[PDB]
């Protein structure tokens, strides 16, 4: 890490002297950059703050290394694209000691090989975990998103309510907020399908709130369609206009797969 | 940091045990022992929390948060007091003046303040959030030639992570911003360069907002290169703003369209 600090600091034409204070001497900083000494994370954060770099930014330039969970996701990712049932199968044996992860691997794997599904008991251990969490992070959001097909609708709806009211984001990083918005829309789709208009109404209000003062045009475009679909299912002719506008957006942006997929929904349900 | 670790762990119903020793884990949490970032990252990893996420739960961030609060209120007196408070910080106060300018036109950074900032941006080997936000907010006070040179430096030497694409998204927006001025000023070599960079940045992303503004601005390019279909592209981008109820973007680009087309 000292190597990376050195590179970033020199890269900003900043002296070691200007970084030194009562917490770390010039000597301690040099010894750290050279790897002769280690410093505390807190003292590193102080240095970074002086360089106007936050520790999450520092970590990504230090190396392409990622967490266990992101490593899991990356593996699963490329296998799902290539339809390789085979190595998802022993990816699943590789993770057997990790209950929520393997439950999630089974959920994903079922989308290309339905013979494997998480058991009701496995899913229930996961939903119990999810209900038990006080703040939803990337982990809980991704677990819920990828296991949703195996959660009963009412538990899914209740889990969604928990997630939208308990996720964490900051002004500098809306990664989790964008995900929460996408999964809320996903629940809204199911709620409309099952004609739970109580649940639909709640979700529409939440989604509108989540999209306020944001860019997020992909979610706004999908929400234009889905809300229009909700409107249609309750006799507003405008709903079809909304859906046709969303189709045009996909079309205009050259998003052919999305265009095709939503136009298929339109021709079927409308 | 020991405090924030505790909360994150415990709000997951995770025991100290099943996570260093129980003692030192416990001991870091109570803010008694300092641990390395290496061991902190290891702990977060065990907790299935990213460092990006951990941070989300910092001088520059504090400044931005205050700016955001006052600007949203359009509160000129409060932004002037913020400017006072940061006057001894050169790039930060220049940026505050640039932002203030948009709601109080009498306030502007001086040529010399802007030059110190662009000298600094030019000197940085790798662009991060700080540099990107400074450029983006000070751009209306930077002459086009300097703006293009810095944009080229930024595009070719910024960093981002797969987990947090914040920087990549901002760089895309600022590249498009530069592109529309390059086309205004008929730097078509510049425009050609930026178009390739933007197309690369957009590849395998959603980023519908950037794609919508790019559809308009690339359409603008096409119109100036003699392709009449560019008009179609620009009108379609406007329709997208309209359909999504994006008033500001719609009326602003419609304005640009009426003057240029």
């Amino acid at each position: 890490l000292g190597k990376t600090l050195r590179r970033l600091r020199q890269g900003k034409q900043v002296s070691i002297s200007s970084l030194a204070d009562e917490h770390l001497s010039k000597s301690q900083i040099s010894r750290f950059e050279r790897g002769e000494s280690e410093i505390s994370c807190s003292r590193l954060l102080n240095l970074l703050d002086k360089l106007n770099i936050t520790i999450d930014e520092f970590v990504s330039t230090h190396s392409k290394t990622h967490t266990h969970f992101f490593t899991l996701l990356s593996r699963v990712r490329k296998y799902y694209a290539e339809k390789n049932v085979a190595k998802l199968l022993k990816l699943l044996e590789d993770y057997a000691h990790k209950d929520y992860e393997s439950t999630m691997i089974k959920a994903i794997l079922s989308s290309i090989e339905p013979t494997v599904e998480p058991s009701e008991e496995e899913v229930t251990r996961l939903t119990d975990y999810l209900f038990s969490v006080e703040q939803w992070g990337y982990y809980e959001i991704i677990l819920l998103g990828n296991c949703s097909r195996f959660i009963n609708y009412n538990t899914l709806f209740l889990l969604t309510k928990e997630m939208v009211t308990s996720f964490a984001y900051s002004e500098q990083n809306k990664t989790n907020k964008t995900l929460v918005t996408q999964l809320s829309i996903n629940c809204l789709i199911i709620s409309i399908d099952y004609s739970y208009f109580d649940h639909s109404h709640y979700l529409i209000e939440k989604i509108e709130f989540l999209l306020r003062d944001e860019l997020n045009f992909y979610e706004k475009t999908v929400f234009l369609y889905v809300h229009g679909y909700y409107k249609l299912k309750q006799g507003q002719v405008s709903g079809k206009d909304d859906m046709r506008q969303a189709l045009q957006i996909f079309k205009y942006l050259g998003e052919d797969a999305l265009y095709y997929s939503y136009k298929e929904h339109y021709r079927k349900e409308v | 940091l020991g405090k924030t670790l505790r909360r994150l762990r415990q709000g997951k119903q995770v025991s100290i045990s099943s996570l260093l020793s129980k003692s030192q884990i416990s001991r870091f949490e109570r803010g008694e022992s300092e641990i390395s970032c290496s061991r902190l990252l290891n702990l977060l990893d065990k907790l299935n929390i990213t460092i990006d996420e951990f941070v989300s739960t910092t001088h520059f961030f504090t400044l931005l948060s205050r700016v955001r609060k006052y600007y949203a209120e359009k509160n000129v007196a409060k932004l002037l007091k913020l400017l006072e408070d940061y006057a001894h910080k050169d790039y930060e106060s220049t940026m505050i003046k640039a932002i203030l300018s948009s709601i109080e036109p009498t306030v502007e950074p001086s040529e010399e303040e802007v030059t110190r900032l662009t000298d600094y941006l030019f000197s940085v080997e790798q662009w991060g959030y700080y540099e990107i936000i400074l450029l983006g907010n000070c751009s209306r006070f930077i002459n086009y030639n300097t703006l293009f040179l810095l944009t080229k430096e930024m595009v070719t030497s910024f960093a981002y992570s797969e987990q947090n694409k914040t920087n990549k998204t901002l760089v895309t927006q600022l590249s498009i911003n530069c592109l529309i001025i390059s086309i205004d000023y008929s730097y078509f070599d510049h425009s050609h360069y930026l178009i390739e960079k933007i197309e690369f940045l957009l590849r395998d992303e959603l980023n519908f907002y950037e794609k919508t503004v790019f559809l308009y601005v690339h359409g603008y390019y096409k119109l100036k290169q003699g392709q009449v279909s560019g008009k179609d592209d620009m009108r379609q981008a406007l329709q997208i703003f309209k359909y999504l109820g994006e008033d500001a973007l719609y009326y602003s680009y419609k304005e640009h369209y009426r003057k240029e087309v």
Partner: peptide, 11 residues
């Protein structure tokens, strides 16, 4: 990458 829909998050 693209979510159409869930789908693989985040694929």
């Amino acid at each position: 990458x693209l979510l159409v829909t869930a789908g693989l998050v985040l694929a």
